Design a protein around this ligand. Structure first.
Ligand SMILES: NC(=O)c1ccc[n+]([C@@H]2O[C@H](COP(=O)([O-])OP(=O)([O-])OC[C@H]3O[C@@H](n4cnc5c(N)[nH+]cnc54)[C@H](O)[C@@H]3O)[C@@H](O)[C@H]2O)c1
Ligand SMILES: NC(=O)c1ccc[n+]([C@@H]2O[C@H](COP(=O)([O-])OP(=O)([O-])OC[C@H]3O[C@@H](n4cnc5c(N)[nH+]cnc54)[C@H](O)[C@@H]3O)[C@@H](O)[C@H]2O)c1
Ligand SMILES: [Zn+2]
Ligand SMILES: [Zn+2]
Ligand SMILES: [Zn+2]
Ligand SMILES: [Zn+2]
Lengths: 374, 374
């Protein structure tokens, strides 16, 4: 009943940094060629969405944020072949165009069509599908999931199992897949190894899940909020440490605990200092450190390259290294077959209209993932 | 006969930084338990030896430097089982104790017994075998090859083929193995790939050798000294570029040349700026950059961690990642079987007594490797 028509719906518009979202009516244009309009069902609150608010992650404003979500296709533009109206789908904040050198590479996943490296806040064609108060509103990472309806490019959507529970599998659109893949795919954690995970939010917990799935013998969680430790242990941490409890720097503590450094470390916070600490705490000759956290915009870290010369490997990744469109449906299928759990990540559920309360919960330290329902 | 006796011999002593070596008589104690005394036959001049002179690499002075060498065992201490008097040997500046966690790890080579991380300038037992003018003289990296005789720990020497030409295979003690391994073992260069090699000295040429052996399609040499380009092409470079020729930063040039970044880059100079440039010029999603150059003491680089978050891998290594005592004899065997060439690295051969002239050749840009003969 809405195909080819502008849809008026509610969205959470961010007009200004460091302000609450405004829940108000937007106009959502119909999809153009190779675009898909999605009726959103559930969306998670990821710290990266908060980074938009805080100016940690710079993207043009005003904006409809949201990137961790699931919904049902309302209509498809001309030439769309990979989804149909009524399909369950997860928007892909990292696209998979299938054609660029990265998409063709066996390891690569950071498709050249992404809007993360140099955000413009548009569709692939450089325009916006959103109007609010008569004004154009930017997209975010090609997804913009904080809206009852969004429009995405076909390369930024994956069809998923028709029987999928969308209020759970929305987490596969960012935080679960990111953390889990960072462990299993990017670091390639080995059986019997010792891992250190810095930051015990939704993504860090998913890292722990992956380290445990990979057979790590020890998984040391690191967080300044000791309230995060119980859940970390539930999902596989063998020990947790709070840097504030120690006189010495935590890289020294972790090196001591691991009898000379850990096999694999993960920065899952977004601080320059913890990126360097996480590198330092891995064993100097054969350790591997993976950066997952998003750093403050345009800031450089300082480090001694002797940390690498001895033999350490330092890498980072977006979305756990997963080729997004290939991997998301498989991850959903695996979830359905109980190969991993998502409930440990979900601490709060709210209606979409309570988005600002959801962000308050994240900022206070109380939540892991709040799932918003439309 | 000399076994069990102090040897008085000629050595090149470095009394203080930024001075010529002093060629004079030293006393070399006999080997203690698990030590080996070696009559030197040939030693190369590696830029790392010059770093000791320039204060780029801090190690206790006064010192007998030299670490890239080959000789013949004169005598063995009690308990030595791996070499005998008369054997051809290469001192190992990275030891292989076989017992530490690094030695037991499949990918580690930076044995915990090394004297590089926190240099003490002694034998494993904390003492020196060298005196000169009544004063104790420090060792360098457990090798000290700028002497007619040295004493090394058993874990810092490998037996090699009795038919080996020592005036060539001394380069397997540092520069060749480092560069070749950095390509084939540390980076794991792939067939058909594009590589960039920063620095076209003995080590960088050996990196090129390895990239070509691994089947790279393109190997771009980068040096500010265009006189290095002809030999780089001889050993496999497909193109060479001098950053001084361009208005733009060379990472931008290399990214353009490689249609979006190289597969593998190598820093083989020892500058903070070129370490960051080399990282930046590899493809952002799947590129790998290896630091080989030795940085100036205690200096930190500055970099934006988004370079890693997109998917790059950054690593470094000592001695090409090779487990030293296992690998050196095999590399010599491979050389004797014509699997690689060493002559392209050798531009000058001088008597040991001309050590200062050999260093002047390096510093002036005129040599690759000078081999000093005893
Ligand atoms: N690379 C990617 O594709 C990707 C995907 C998803 C999230 N992210 C980023 O990953 C990070 C974590 O996201 P999240 O799990 O949603 O966030 P979160 O829920 O805010 O978790 C971060 C955790 O870090 C803890 N923390 C804060 N400061 C420190 C400190 N100094 N030492 C130790 N712990 C500390 C904090 O208490 C919290 O539990 C954020 O920077 C995100 O932007 C990256
Ligand atoms: N990691 C290891 O185990 C290991 C082993 C051996 C050598 N090294 C280091 O590797 C480096 C190279 O050693 P080497 O080959 O004997 O030295 P080298 O022969 O002096 O070669 C260095 C090359 O770098 C070139 N160069 C200098 N500045 C620049 C610049 N800004 N941009 C581009 N090219 C430049 C220079 O012209 C020369 O051809 C040194 O720092 C050594 O200390 C490390
Ligand atoms: Zn692509
Ligand atoms: Zn996210
Ligand atoms: Zn060892
Ligand atoms: Zn060397």
């Amino acid at each position: 009943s809405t195909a080819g028509k502008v849809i008026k719906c509610k969205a959470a518009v961010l007009w200004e940094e460091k302000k609450p979202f405004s829940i108000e009516e937007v106009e959502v244009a119909p999809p153009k060629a190779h675009e898909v309009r999605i009726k959103m069902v559930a969306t998670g609150i990821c710290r990266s969405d908060d980074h938009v608010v805080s100016g940690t992650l710079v993207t043009p404003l005003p904006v409809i944020a949201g990137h961790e979500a699931a919904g049902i296709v309302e209509s498809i533009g001309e030439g769309v072949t990979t989804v149909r109206p009524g399909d369950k789908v997860i928007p892909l904040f990292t696209p998979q165009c299938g054609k660029c050198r990265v998409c063709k590479h066996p390891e690569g996943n950071f498709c050249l069509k992404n809007d993360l490296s140099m955000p413009r806040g548009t569709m692939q064609d450089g325009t916006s599908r959103f109007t609010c108060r008569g004004k154009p509103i930017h997209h975010f990472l090609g997804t913009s999931t904080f809206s009852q309806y969004t429009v995405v490019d076909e390369i930024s959507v994956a069809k998923i199992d028709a029987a999928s529970p969308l209020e759970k599998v929305c987490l596969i659109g960012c935080g679960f897949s990111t953390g889990y893949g960072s462990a299993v795919k990017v670091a390639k954690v080995t059986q019997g190894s010792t891992c250190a995970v810095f930051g015990l939010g939704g993504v860090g917990l998913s890292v722990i899940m992956g380290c445990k799935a990979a057979g790590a013998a020890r998984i040391i969680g690191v967080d300044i909020n000791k309230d995060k430790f119980a859940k970390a242990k539930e999902v596989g941490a063998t020990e947790c440490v709070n840097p504030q409890d120690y006189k010495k720097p935590i890289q020294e503590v972790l090196t001591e605990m691991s009898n000379g450094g850990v096999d694999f470390s993960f920065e899952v916070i977004g601080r320059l200092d913890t990126m360097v600490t996480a590198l330092s705490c891995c064993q100097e000759a054969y350790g591997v450190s993976v950066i997952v956290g998003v750093p403050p915009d345009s800031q450089n870290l300082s480090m001694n390259p002797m940390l690498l010369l001895s033999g350490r490997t330092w890498k980072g990744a977006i979305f756990g290294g997963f080729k997004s469109k290939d991997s998301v449906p498989k991850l959903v299928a695996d979830f359905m077959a109980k190969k991993f759990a998502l409930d440990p990540l979900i601490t709060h559920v709210l209606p979409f209209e309570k988005i600002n309360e959801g962000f308050d919960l994240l900022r206070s330290g109380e939540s892991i993932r709040t799932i918003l329902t439309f």
